[model samples]
Target: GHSYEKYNNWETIEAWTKQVTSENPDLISRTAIGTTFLGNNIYLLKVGKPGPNKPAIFMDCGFHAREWISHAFCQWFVREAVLTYGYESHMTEFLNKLDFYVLPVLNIDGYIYTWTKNRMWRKTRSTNAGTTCIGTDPNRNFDAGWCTTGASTDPCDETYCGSAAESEKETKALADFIRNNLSSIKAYLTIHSYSQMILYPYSYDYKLPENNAELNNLAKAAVKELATLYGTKYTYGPGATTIYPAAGGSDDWAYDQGIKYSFTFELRDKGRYGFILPESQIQATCEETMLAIKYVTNYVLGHL
Candidate 1:
């Protein structure tokens, strides 16, 4: 078993998922929430004790193939949960109280494409009518604002929103999973890359969420907590205002689904390495993100 020392390919990551679950049944259990367009299974892992009704935080990574760090963080999160469960009082308490639905690879096809075809691929490998490009921006395929502002209609564009809302299998699968589990899920967090920011929903537009104040306060505190590990600063606010106006984003869709606190995390570097982040730094990056996520998880637990 190769340790989480560097960035790994999908094969290693996939094997590690089952390996972790099989090795630690008490803390981890797995399920296939959806399959990609290419027929790859999208595995969802639940990290917590067995329960009838427990609040959950739904986390997704590898939405864009190039954002390798995002997927790496998800893998690291699972490792931390099991490795430190009994030894770390806070983690033990958090897992025992609130379940975490960790979708390690939401864009399986795109991720695989990044490994084999192009290192900078940013969408699902789904073909469109009369178009040479073979992918839709999975981020823009959600039903949020959907192709309104930051998305593109041109098939050749990187931000193509797809044929329609939830047109991509990966997006629909995720939507179905969230909708089915809405009763127990309270928060939605999607991890991305190349920027240091914790953004909330309403990315489909400029409107503020009803719980804007609460979300902002939590982001403020979370960023503060995240900075302690390596002095890494993060900007936090509504997605449209914090960064750009993006339509059909999952964060926006998750918010509309009644998840009060939906956030998108753009992790590490202001853009030094961009998509080609170094493997040696993966540990520090995941460690700091772990801190921020734990902080938010604790907050969600208290409010629920």
Candidate 2:
């Protein structure tokens, strides 16, 4: 069986990244986009066949430091891709057709802080000038409608946006990487927690994307696929209406950059356990979530 409880710390995550990419070299390759605020490597793993600017999809986890399940999904995803590609024909086909750029953890600094200092930490570990608050809510630091709604300018707030859009190094690194790879990227998916929602773009405002219908339809289909595995129900819609209006979310920024299939996944049981999800739940959550991910990837491949 795969190990979930075995690796749950900064050092373990780092070791596992090295081990997975080392062992599954043919199917996975790693790239360091940039370093984090605390000087940790923000690694992006590319899964599938190598080619020249092939249609690709980007998905990241751990935007919020406490969402360990979100981070776990990224590792589970790459591990699944490595394990199932040859044995599963459909998965093999998907691998041959497109690339999956998976970033297992973005908020490395804050995540480590969660382990060592405060378990409830939920922002980037980059400090600023005005206040003593040590982190920026990287989710709200993106440029899309940036800090305009469901976000705060107060440095001490949990949803604090940085002094400026893309102010956090982690946010800027991700944005810069995506911007540079816009031509190859077809979809953008960000994972969050405690809501069991599959959200599309325009979280900053009520206005829908130009391809609103297609996005809504796709979200529904993906959520439906996810339900088949564990009866894990997920609501799907624009981020504003389905959940809450949030400015500066990565999905909105990605959609604005013309990646039409952008999505944000709020995973697992809805707030009962919250961020303290049990280790036993990891396998099932990852399994059910993979259904939606594969479903979305297949749809993207067809459209591409």
Candidate 3:
């Protein structure tokens, strides 16, 4: 019923999380870190071989409901990690030394809404107070520079920043989990789609990260690696400059939390297909993305 080359609805993905963990217990473990506004369980898959005090890289997808390809990539990443752990030299070493805290879908309510109610929903399914409008943009509800720029204060807007920082239930859950596990979270990667780019911190403002040079070089290398397959070109830099300024983004929040190697990947298409990227392109997109992710992982491991 579930195929990695195709998009899976929430039900199928939830089951896959458990089935994959059970089948590859040596490489994957499952835990429900939190629940969404609609009371759906938010599952996190910890992928790696068992080890003592291993540092971790945090990666999440489906920040927005419409980005189906983002969700597909997360699942693909886990499949690739487990399948290639023994044979892929870099992956094997990465799994042995570092664990990947992969949140397969962060905005579960919105994702489900996209499949059932509306195909273009982009926020959580929580009811906003004092308004008929529902949902807050999870990405815009984070704490970093909360709602100051590139965000909206209106409850009806798509980029609503919510009532306060981490106001949305899903955003709070994710932030709390990261806060609790800050010690072991070395890098943060949040995946989105429709733009071929790799972005770094200070997205809420026009400020640069402290390790700007290292991040720039790393992004360059990662983009170069991604282009190797399918020639998918990706522009990379600080989110404010490379892309647009986005207040309360998860990547910015994570970086301010001292995870210097934070990134927000806007994957594929360059807007021809946009969020409705075809299922046929899933394989090629994930394959190219794998290169960049592995490149970043290798760099993080070497530095750590």
Q: What TM-score goes with each of the models?
A: 0.98, 0.97, 0.99
Model 3 poorest 10 in a row by lDDT: 200-209
Model 2 TM-score on a 0 to 1 scale:
0.97
The order by descending TM-score is 3, 1, 2
Q: Provide the clash count, candidate 1.
A: 1
How many residue pairs of model 3 clash at the backbone?
Answer: 0
Q: Give candidate 3 misplaced runs (Cα > 4 Å).
A: none
Cα deviation of 118 in candidate 1 (Å)?
0.7
For candidate 3, the TM-score is 0.99
* Residue range 237-303, candidate 1, lDDT tens digits: 9998889899999999999989998999999878999888899889988999999999999999889
Q: Per-residue lDDT tens digits of candidate 2, residues 150-240?
A: 9988898899998999988899999999999999999999998878999998899999999999988999999999999889899999999
Computed on alpha carbons, the lDDT of every model, listed in order, comes to: 0.91, 0.90, 0.94
Whole-model lDDT, model 3 = 0.94
Mark the 10 consecutive residues where model 2 has the least summed lDDT.
Answer: 1-10
Error of 1 at 16 (Å): 1.0
RMSD of each: 0.9, 1.4, 0.7
Which one is best on TM-score?
3
Whichever of 1 and 2 has more TM-score, that candidate is 1
Model 1 — TM-score against the truth?
0.98
Best-to-worst lDDT order: 3, 1, 2
